[PDB]
mmCIF file of all heavy atoms in Angstrom:
data_model
loop_
_atom_site.group_PDB
_atom_site.id
_atom_site.type_symbol
_atom_site.label_atom_id
_atom_site.label_comp_id
_atom_site.label_asym_id
_atom_site.label_seq_id
_atom_site.Cartn_x
_atom_site.Cartn_y
_atom_site.Cartn_z
ATOM 1 N N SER A 1 0.821 -1.200 0.000
ATOM 2 C CA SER A 1 0.000 0.000 0.000
ATOM 3 C C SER A 1 0.872 1.275 0.000
ATOM 4 O O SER A 1 0.524 2.269 -0.635
ATOM 5 C CB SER A 1 -0.943 -0.011 1.205
ATOM 6 O OG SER A 1 -1.663 1.203 1.304
ATOM 7 N N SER A 2 2.019 1.240 0.713
ATOM 8 C CA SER A 2 2.889 2.426 0.760
ATOM 9 C C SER A 2 3.537 2.746 -0.605
ATOM 10 O O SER A 2 4.027 3.858 -0.764
ATOM 11 C CB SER A 2 3.965 2.301 1.838
ATOM 12 O OG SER A 2 5.051 1.520 1.374
ATOM 13 N N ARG A 3 3.561 1.783 -1.557
ATOM 14 C CA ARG A 3 4.117 2.008 -2.906
ATOM 15 C C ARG A 3 3.019 2.146 -3.997
ATOM 16 O O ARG A 3 3.338 2.444 -5.161
ATOM 17 C CB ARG A 3 5.037 0.822 -3.313
ATOM 18 C CG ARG A 3 6.305 0.727 -2.428
ATOM 19 C CD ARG A 3 7.202 -0.442 -2.846
ATOM 20 N NE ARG A 3 7.766 -0.259 -4.200
ATOM 21 C CZ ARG A 3 8.936 -0.752 -4.598
ATOM 22 N NH1 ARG A 3 9.693 -1.451 -3.756
ATOM 23 N NH2 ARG A 3 9.378 -0.517 -5.834
ATOM 24 N N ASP A 4 1.739 1.868 -3.630
ATOM 25 C CA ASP A 4 0.623 1.817 -4.586
ATOM 26 C C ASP A 4 0.917 0.731 -5.654
ATOM 27 O O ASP A 4 0.509 0.901 -6.802
ATOM 28 C CB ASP A 4 0.299 3.164 -5.251
ATOM 29 C CG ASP A 4 -0.927 3.141 -6.185
ATOM 30 O OD1 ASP A 4 -1.941 2.497 -5.824
ATOM 31 O OD2 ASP A 4 -0.845 3.724 -7.286
ATOM 32 N N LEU A 5 1.545 -0.405 -5.265
ATOM 33 C CA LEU A 5 1.767 -1.498 -6.227
ATOM 34 C C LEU A 5 1.114 -2.801 -5.793
ATOM 35 O O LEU A 5 1.085 -3.130 -4.598
ATOM 36 C CB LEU A 5 3.271 -1.793 -6.447
ATOM 37 C CG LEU A 5 4.091 -0.732 -7.203
ATOM 38 C CD1 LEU A 5 5.560 -1.183 -7.313
ATOM 39 C CD2 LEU A 5 3.536 -0.514 -8.628
ATOM 40 N N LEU A 6 0.776 -3.621 -6.802
ATOM 41 C CA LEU A 6 0.263 -4.958 -6.573
ATOM 42 C C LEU A 6 0.723 -5.809 -7.770
ATOM 43 O O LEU A 6 0.687 -5.346 -8.922
ATOM 44 C CB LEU A 6 -1.288 -4.958 -6.412
ATOM 45 C CG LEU A 6 -1.909 -6.348 -6.179
ATOM 46 C CD1 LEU A 6 -3.171 -6.278 -5.320
ATOM 47 C CD2 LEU A 6 -2.223 -7.051 -7.520
ATOM 48 N N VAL A 7 1.204 -7.010 -7.500
ATOM 49 C CA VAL A 7 1.638 -7.943 -8.532
ATOM 50 C C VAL A 7 0.793 -9.204 -8.391
ATOM 51 O O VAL A 7 0.635 -9.728 -7.284
ATOM 52 C CB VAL A 7 3.153 -8.281 -8.385
ATOM 53 C CG1 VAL A 7 3.600 -9.313 -9.451
ATOM 54 C CG2 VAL A 7 4.001 -7.005 -8.478
ATOM 55 N N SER A 8 0.247 -9.670 -9.514
ATOM 56 C CA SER A 8 -0.555 -10.874 -9.546
ATOM 57 C C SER A 8 0.062 -11.870 -10.556
ATOM 58 O O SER A 8 0.867 -11.472 -11.414
ATOM 59 C CB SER A 8 -2.017 -10.560 -9.883
ATOM 60 O OG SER A 8 -2.189 -9.952 -11.153
ATOM 61 N N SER A 9 -0.283 -13.161 -10.427
ATOM 62 C CA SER A 9 0.260 -14.164 -11.345
ATOM 63 C C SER A 9 -0.599 -14.333 -12.605
ATOM 64 O O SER A 9 -1.812 -14.119 -12.576
ATOM 65 C CB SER A 9 0.462 -15.494 -10.628
ATOM 66 O OG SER A 9 -0.771 -15.901 -10.085
ATOM 67 N N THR A 10 0.037 -14.686 -13.731
ATOM 68 C CA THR A 10 -0.701 -14.889 -14.985
ATOM 69 C C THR A 10 -0.408 -16.303 -15.550
ATOM 70 O O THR A 10 0.603 -16.922 -15.192
ATOM 71 C CB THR A 10 -0.297 -13.825 -16.039
ATOM 72 O OG1 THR A 10 1.050 -14.078 -16.439
ATOM 73 C CG2 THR A 10 -0.466 -12.397 -15.539
ATOM 74 N N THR A 11 -1.248 -16.775 -16.464
ATOM 75 C CA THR A 11 -1.014 -18.071 -17.104
ATOM 76 C C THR A 11 -0.186 -17.879 -18.392
ATOM 77 O O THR A 11 0.600 -18.757 -18.753
ATOM 78 C CB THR A 11 -2.334 -18.806 -17.341
ATOM 79 O OG1 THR A 11 -3.202 -17.951 -18.096
ATOM 80 C CG2 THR A 11 -3.018 -19.197 -16.042
ATOM 81 N N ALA A 12 -0.351 -16.737 -19.081
ATOM 82 C CA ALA A 12 0.385 -16.477 -20.315
ATOM 83 C C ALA A 12 1.691 -15.709 -20.052
ATOM 84 O O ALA A 12 1.799 -14.979 -19.061
ATOM 85 C CB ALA A 12 -0.492 -15.703 -21.290
ATOM 86 N N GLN A 13 2.672 -15.864 -20.946
ATOM 87 C CA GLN A 13 3.947 -15.173 -20.785
ATOM 88 C C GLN A 13 3.798 -13.716 -21.212
ATOM 89 O O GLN A 13 3.151 -13.438 -22.228
ATOM 90 C CB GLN A 13 5.043 -15.865 -21.593
ATOM 91 C CG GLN A 13 6.416 -15.767 -20.932
ATOM 92 C CD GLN A 13 6.552 -16.748 -19.774
ATOM 93 O OE1 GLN A 13 5.859 -17.778 -19.694
ATOM 94 N NE2 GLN A 13 7.459 -16.459 -18.845
ATOM 95 N N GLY A 14 4.354 -12.806 -20.414
ATOM 96 C CA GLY A 14 4.272 -11.374 -20.637
ATOM 97 C C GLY A 14 4.998 -10.833 -21.846
ATOM 98 O O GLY A 14 5.786 -11.537 -22.465
ATOM 99 N N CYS A 15 4.723 -9.559 -22.183
ATOM 100 C CA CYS A 15 5.289 -8.880 -23.350
ATOM 101 C C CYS A 15 6.419 -7.894 -22.983
ATOM 102 O O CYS A 15 7.210 -7.539 -23.848
ATOM 103 C CB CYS A 15 4.169 -8.165 -24.101
ATOM 104 S SG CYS A 15 3.282 -6.918 -23.114
ATOM 105 N N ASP A 16 6.472 -7.423 -21.726
ATOM 106 C CA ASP A 16 7.441 -6.414 -21.282
ATOM 107 C C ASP A 16 8.734 -6.989 -20.701
ATOM 108 O O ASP A 16 8.764 -8.153 -20.308
ATOM 109 C CB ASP A 16 6.776 -5.477 -20.232
ATOM 110 C CG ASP A 16 5.585 -4.723 -20.805
ATOM 111 O OD1 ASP A 16 5.776 -4.001 -21.814
ATOM 112 O OD2 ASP A 16 4.455 -4.842 -20.227
ATOM 113 N N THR A 17 9.811 -6.152 -20.654
ATOM 114 C CA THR A 17 11.073 -6.413 -19.956
ATOM 115 C C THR A 17 11.328 -5.166 -19.006
ATOM 116 O O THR A 17 10.911 -4.043 -19.323
ATOM 117 C CB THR A 17 12.251 -6.669 -20.890
ATOM 118 O OG1 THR A 17 12.538 -5.484 -21.620
ATOM 119 C CG2 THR A 17 12.022 -7.851 -21.878
ATOM 120 N N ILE A 18 12.025 -5.383 -17.862
ATOM 121 C CA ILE A 18 12.227 -4.379 -16.823
ATOM 122 C C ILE A 18 13.624 -3.785 -16.875
ATOM 123 O O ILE A 18 14.612 -4.525 -16.964
ATOM 124 C CB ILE A 18 12.032 -5.018 -15.418
ATOM 125 C CG1 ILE A 18 10.698 -5.806 -15.331
ATOM 126 C CG2 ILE A 18 12.080 -3.929 -14.297
ATOM 127 C CD1 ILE A 18 9.424 -4.922 -15.638
ATOM 128 N N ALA A 19 13.716 -2.468 -16.775
ATOM 129 C CA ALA A 19 15.019 -1.795 -16.753
ATOM 130 C C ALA A 19 15.704 -2.082 -15.411
ATOM 131 O O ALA A 19 15.038 -2.139 -14.378
ATOM 132 C CB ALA A 19 14.826 -0.298 -16.901
ATOM 133 N N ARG A 20 17.033 -2.198 -15.414
ATOM 134 C CA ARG A 20 17.792 -2.428 -14.174
ATOM 135 C C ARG A 20 18.916 -1.375 -14.309
ATOM 136 O O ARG A 20 19.996 -1.649 -14.850
ATOM 137 C CB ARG A 20 18.358 -3.864 -14.149
ATOM 138 C CG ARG A 20 17.295 -4.979 -14.100
ATOM 139 C CD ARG A 20 16.310 -4.906 -12.931
ATOM 140 N NE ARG A 20 15.341 -6.002 -13.018
ATOM 141 C CZ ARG A 20 14.191 -6.056 -12.340
ATOM 142 N NH1 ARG A 20 13.863 -5.087 -11.494
ATOM 143 N NH2 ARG A 20 13.370 -7.080 -12.500
ATOM 144 N N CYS A 21 18.607 -0.147 -13.893
ATOM 145 C CA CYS A 21 19.478 1.000 -14.177
ATOM 146 C C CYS A 21 19.191 2.157 -13.200
ATOM 147 O O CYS A 21 18.278 2.075 -12.366
ATOM 148 C CB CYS A 21 19.192 1.443 -15.608
ATOM 149 S SG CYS A 21 17.539 2.165 -15.799
ATOM 150 N N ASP A 22 19.903 3.291 -13.397
ATOM 151 C CA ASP A 22 19.665 4.497 -12.618
ATOM 152 C C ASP A 22 19.278 5.662 -13.535
ATOM 153 O O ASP A 22 19.519 6.800 -13.179
ATOM 154 C CB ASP A 22 20.902 4.874 -11.777
ATOM 155 C CG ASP A 22 22.138 5.200 -12.595
ATOM 156 O OD1 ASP A 22 22.099 5.028 -13.839
ATOM 157 O OD2 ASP A 22 23.149 5.629 -11.994
ATOM 158 N N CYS A 23 18.668 5.401 -14.710
ATOM 159 C CA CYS A 23 18.197 6.476 -15.589
ATOM 160 C C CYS A 23 17.261 7.441 -14.853
ATOM 161 O O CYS A 23 16.447 7.024 -14.017
ATOM 162 C CB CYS A 23 17.485 5.890 -16.803
ATOM 163 S SG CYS A 23 18.579 5.161 -18.068
ATOM 164 N N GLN A 24 17.380 8.716 -15.161
ATOM 165 C CA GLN A 24 16.492 9.759 -14.670
ATOM 166 C C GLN A 24 15.812 10.503 -15.819
ATOM 167 O O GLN A 24 15.295 11.589 -15.601
ATOM 168 C CB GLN A 24 17.178 10.738 -13.736
ATOM 169 C CG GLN A 24 17.426 10.158 -12.381
ATOM 170 C CD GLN A 24 18.010 11.218 -11.470
ATOM 171 O OE1 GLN A 24 19.184 11.159 -11.085
ATOM 172 N NE2 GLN A 24 17.208 12.228 -11.131
ATOM 173 N N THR A 25 15.872 9.957 -17.057
ATOM 174 C CA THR A 25 15.121 10.493 -18.198
ATOM 175 C C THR A 25 14.445 9.293 -18.869
ATOM 176 O O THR A 25 14.947 8.153 -18.824
ATOM 177 C CB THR A 25 16.005 11.285 -19.194
ATOM 178 O OG1 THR A 25 16.901 10.382 -19.824
ATOM 179 C CG2 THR A 25 16.783 12.407 -18.523
ATOM 180 N N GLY A 26 13.327 9.563 -19.516
ATOM 181 C CA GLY A 26 12.579 8.506 -20.179
ATOM 182 C C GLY A 26 11.376 9.091 -20.901
ATOM 183 O O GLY A 26 11.292 10.312 -21.113
ATOM 184 N N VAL A 27 10.466 8.218 -21.286
ATOM 185 C CA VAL A 27 9.254 8.572 -22.006
ATOM 186 C C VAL A 27 8.095 7.830 -21.325
ATOM 187 O O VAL A 27 8.185 6.613 -21.114
ATOM 188 C CB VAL A 27 9.363 8.204 -23.517
ATOM 189 C CG1 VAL A 27 8.043 8.464 -24.239
ATOM 190 C CG2 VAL A 27 10.489 8.978 -24.194
ATOM 191 N N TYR A 28 6.984 8.538 -21.069
ATOM 192 C CA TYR A 28 5.819 7.883 -20.482
ATOM 193 C C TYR A 28 4.589 8.011 -21.360
ATOM 194 O O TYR A 28 4.501 8.958 -22.137
ATOM 195 C CB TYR A 28 5.480 8.396 -19.049
ATOM 196 C CG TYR A 28 4.822 9.760 -18.982
ATOM 197 C CD1 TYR A 28 3.473 9.895 -18.668
ATOM 198 C CD2 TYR A 28 5.558 10.922 -19.165
ATOM 199 C CE1 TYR A 28 2.873 11.156 -18.555
ATOM 200 C CE2 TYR A 28 4.967 12.182 -19.065
ATOM 201 C CZ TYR A 28 3.620 12.298 -18.771
ATOM 202 O OH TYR A 28 3.068 13.573 -18.681
ATOM 203 N N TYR A 29 3.643 7.076 -21.211
ATOM 204 C CA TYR A 29 2.397 7.177 -21.962
ATOM 205 C C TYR A 29 1.346 7.913 -21.116
ATOM 206 O O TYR A 29 1.093 7.544 -19.948
ATOM 207 C CB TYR A 29 1.866 5.782 -22.342
ATOM 208 C CG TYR A 29 0.593 5.906 -23.134
ATOM 209 C CD1 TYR A 29 0.592 6.483 -24.399
ATOM 210 C CD2 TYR A 29 -0.619 5.462 -22.618
ATOM 211 C CE1 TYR A 29 -0.578 6.593 -25.139
ATOM 212 C CE2 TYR A 29 -1.803 5.616 -23.332
ATOM 213 C CZ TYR A 29 -1.773 6.174 -24.594
ATOM 214 O OH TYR A 29 -2.918 6.307 -25.332
ATOM 215 N N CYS A 30 0.718 8.931 -21.720
ATOM 216 C CA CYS A 30 -0.287 9.762 -21.072
ATOM 217 C C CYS A 30 -1.653 9.515 -21.742
ATOM 218 O O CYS A 30 -1.948 10.088 -22.798
ATOM 219 C CB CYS A 30 0.118 11.233 -21.161
ATOM 220 S SG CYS A 30 -1.122 12.382 -20.488
ATOM 221 N N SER A 31 -2.480 8.644 -21.135
ATOM 222 C CA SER A 31 -3.765 8.271 -21.733
ATOM 223 C C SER A 31 -4.718 9.428 -21.928
ATOM 224 O O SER A 31 -5.441 9.443 -22.939
ATOM 225 C CB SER A 31 -4.437 7.145 -20.951
ATOM 226 O OG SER A 31 -4.718 7.557 -19.628
ATOM 227 N N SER A 32 -4.671 10.459 -21.048
ATOM 228 C CA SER A 32 -5.543 11.640 -21.194
ATOM 229 C C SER A 32 -5.180 12.578 -22.380
ATOM 230 O O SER A 32 -5.927 13.530 -22.694
ATOM 231 C CB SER A 32 -5.584 12.457 -19.907
ATOM 232 O OG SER A 32 -4.307 12.996 -19.593
ATOM 233 N N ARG A 33 -4.059 12.302 -23.042
ATOM 234 C CA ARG A 33 -3.642 13.003 -24.248
ATOM 235 C C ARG A 33 -3.451 11.997 -25.419
ATOM 236 O O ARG A 33 -3.075 12.431 -26.511
ATOM 237 C CB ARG A 33 -2.327 13.770 -23.990
ATOM 238 C CG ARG A 33 -2.484 14.955 -23.004
ATOM 239 C CD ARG A 33 -3.303 16.076 -23.636
ATOM 240 N NE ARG A 33 -3.527 17.207 -22.716
ATOM 241 C CZ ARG A 33 -4.556 17.305 -21.884
ATOM 242 N NH1 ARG A 33 -5.456 16.336 -21.817
ATOM 243 N NH2 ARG A 33 -4.681 18.367 -21.090
ATOM 244 N N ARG A 34 -3.592 10.659 -25.168
ATOM 245 C CA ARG A 34 -3.325 9.610 -26.153
ATOM 246 C C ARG A 34 -1.909 9.845 -26.793
ATOM 247 O O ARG A 34 -1.735 9.764 -28.017
ATOM 248 C CB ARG A 34 -4.436 9.618 -27.212
ATOM 249 C CG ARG A 34 -4.750 8.273 -27.815
ATOM 250 C CD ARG A 34 -5.890 8.424 -28.839
ATOM 251 N NE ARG A 34 -7.201 8.245 -28.217
ATOM 252 C CZ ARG A 34 -8.247 9.044 -28.421
ATOM 253 N NH1 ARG A 34 -8.135 10.118 -29.209
ATOM 254 N NH2 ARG A 34 -9.408 8.798 -27.815
ATOM 255 N N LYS A 35 -0.931 10.199 -25.963
ATOM 256 C CA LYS A 35 0.410 10.555 -26.483
ATOM 257 C C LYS A 35 1.486 10.150 -25.492
ATOM 258 O O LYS A 35 1.225 10.082 -24.294
ATOM 259 C CB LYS A 35 0.521 12.108 -26.579
ATOM 260 C CG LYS A 35 0.097 12.741 -27.877
ATOM 261 C CD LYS A 35 0.432 14.246 -27.845
ATOM 262 C CE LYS A 35 0.090 14.925 -29.162
ATOM 263 N NZ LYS A 35 -0.596 16.232 -28.961
ATOM 264 N N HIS A 36 2.707 10.011 -25.992
ATOM 265 C CA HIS A 36 3.886 9.783 -25.163
ATOM 266 C C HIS A 36 4.616 11.108 -25.008
ATOM 267 O O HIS A 36 4.683 11.920 -25.968
ATOM 268 C CB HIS A 36 4.831 8.792 -25.835
ATOM 269 C CG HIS A 36 4.227 7.429 -26.030
ATOM 270 N ND1 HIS A 36 4.558 6.355 -25.208
ATOM 271 C CD2 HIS A 36 3.414 6.989 -27.007
ATOM 272 C CE1 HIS A 36 3.896 5.325 -25.692
ATOM 273 N NE2 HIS A 36 3.204 5.653 -26.775
#
């Protein structure tokens, strides 16, 4: 609850990979603008 995260298990294999870095720049998806 202190991180606002929850992880659940799935039957199918996922599509994403996780960064393991200290980057402080990136790109995010903003659904309220339908844009990155």
Side-chain angles (χ1 to χ4, degrees):
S1 174
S2 81
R3 294 180 65 151
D4 184 41
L5 290 179
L6 179 149
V7 178
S8 61
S9 57
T10 69
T11 55
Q13 213 77 24
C15 60
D16 299 302
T17 66
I18 309 302
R20 295 303 179 196
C21 68
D22 62 354
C23 285
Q24 285 184 249
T25 67
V27 175
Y28 75 107
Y29 181 66
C30 176
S31 62
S32 64
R33 292 291 178 271
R34 211 179 270 134
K35 270 187 177 136
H36 298 257

